[PDB]
Amino acid sequence: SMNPPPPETSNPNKPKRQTNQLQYLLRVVLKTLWKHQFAWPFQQPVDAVKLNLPDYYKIIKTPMDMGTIKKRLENNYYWNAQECIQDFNTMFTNCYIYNKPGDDIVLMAEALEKLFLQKINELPTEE
Numbered sequence: 001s002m003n004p005p006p007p008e009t010s011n012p013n014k015p016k017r018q019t020n021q022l023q024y025l026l027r028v029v030l031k032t033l034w035k036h037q038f039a040w041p042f043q044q045p046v047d048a049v050k051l052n053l054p055d056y057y058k059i060i061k062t063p064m065d066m067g068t069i070k071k072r073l074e075n076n077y078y079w080n081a082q083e084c085i086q087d088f089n090t091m092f093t094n095c096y097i098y099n100k101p102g103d104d105i106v107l108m109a110e111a112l113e114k115l116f117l118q119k120i121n122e123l124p125t126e127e
């Protein structure tokens with residue numbers, strides 16, 4: 001069994017900038033979700049080898065996790081907030097696609113997603 005390489009967190013060919021929205025996504029959104037009691041399965045890529053999920057990366061072809069997002073924010077990898085918001089949504093959607101309603105991991109994603117929604121509702125206007 002073998003895991004794929006993780007998503008990239010650096011790339012000089014990718015355009016990027018800092019924005020107050022992206023600052024908010026790190027200081028408020030990522031920080032809030034990262035400290036949550038249910039964050040830990042989402043803090044790094046799914047290790048399909050150690051978890052014995054050999055079909056994981058047959059079903060999930062756009063991997064994402066908060067470890068990757070955290071690095072992308074810390075590295076100022078993004079051009080805009082939408083790119084980062086999309087990564088969070090991919091992470092949640094992957095969980096729901098792979099798993100089943102009522103599963104513990106789905107309850108965990110739901111709890112993180114609730115907070116994510118609450119925070120992005122007050123994404124500041126671009127300055």
Ligand SMILES: Cc1sc2c(c1C)C(c1ccc(Cl)cc1)=N[C@@H](CC(=O)OC(C)(C)C)c1[nH]nc(C)[n+]1-2
Nearest residue numbers: 040041042046047051052053095098099104105108
């Ligand atoms: C490190 C990680 S990453 C992860 C899990 C764990 C443990 C857990 C999980 C985490 C916490 C609790 Cl309470 C229950 C399950 N679930 C798997 C899928 C699965 O069913 O795995 C087992 C067969 C359970 C190994 C899954 N899907 N998406 C993610 C992000 N995860």
Ligand SMILES: [Cl-]
Nearest residue numbers: 009010011012
């Ligand atoms: Cl980069």
